[PDB]
Amino acid sequence: AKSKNHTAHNQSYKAHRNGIKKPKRQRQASTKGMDPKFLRNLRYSRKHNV
């Protein structure tokens, strides 16, 4: 009747039975959040490639 309960018992099992899903490493890694001063330049060069 003690409504406060807490364990991590069985939580490693639930985590690992379907693996700890690592994200697929990526060619062309994402730029979102990067330094806008760096990204404006980076975009503008690709604007003026030949």
């Binding site: 639930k14 985590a15 690992h16 379907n18 693996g19 700890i20 899903k21 690592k22 994200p23 890694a29 959040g33 990067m34 330094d35 760096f38």
Partner: protein, 156 residues
Amino acid sequence: PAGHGLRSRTRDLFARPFRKKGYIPLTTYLRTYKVGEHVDVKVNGAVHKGMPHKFYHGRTGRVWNVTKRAIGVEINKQVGNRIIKKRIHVRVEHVQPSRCNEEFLQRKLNNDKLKAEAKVRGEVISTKRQPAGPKPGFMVEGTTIETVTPIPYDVV
């Protein structure tokens, strides 16, 4: 929040080491970073800005965006049944470049050199490390051999 603020449980995590208190040596500022290097996040007690949460003290990750006074690190935090690549910006005082890849990047060239040297001669080689295995036989030039016997028990 929810019982624990940002800098909880860090009575000893964030302290300076003994007799290394006070000033910041200039080398921690003149070591320069480039996007892709592997750096170690270790918080510094005395610099209170840009600090990373106590979770990140003692991890390693790849720089992913470098700005003035600030490095963007991208490291894996394991939550639930998945790995989240968290992206933090830490002031440069809190990061030291790692020597994890020191041996790797040395050995990469040490390998390509021998693949070149093998292309020179009979172009067969194998550039791999093997863990320390069976040691071959050898003679022992018989020396004085010390006899040791278990000691009688002196209660005192």
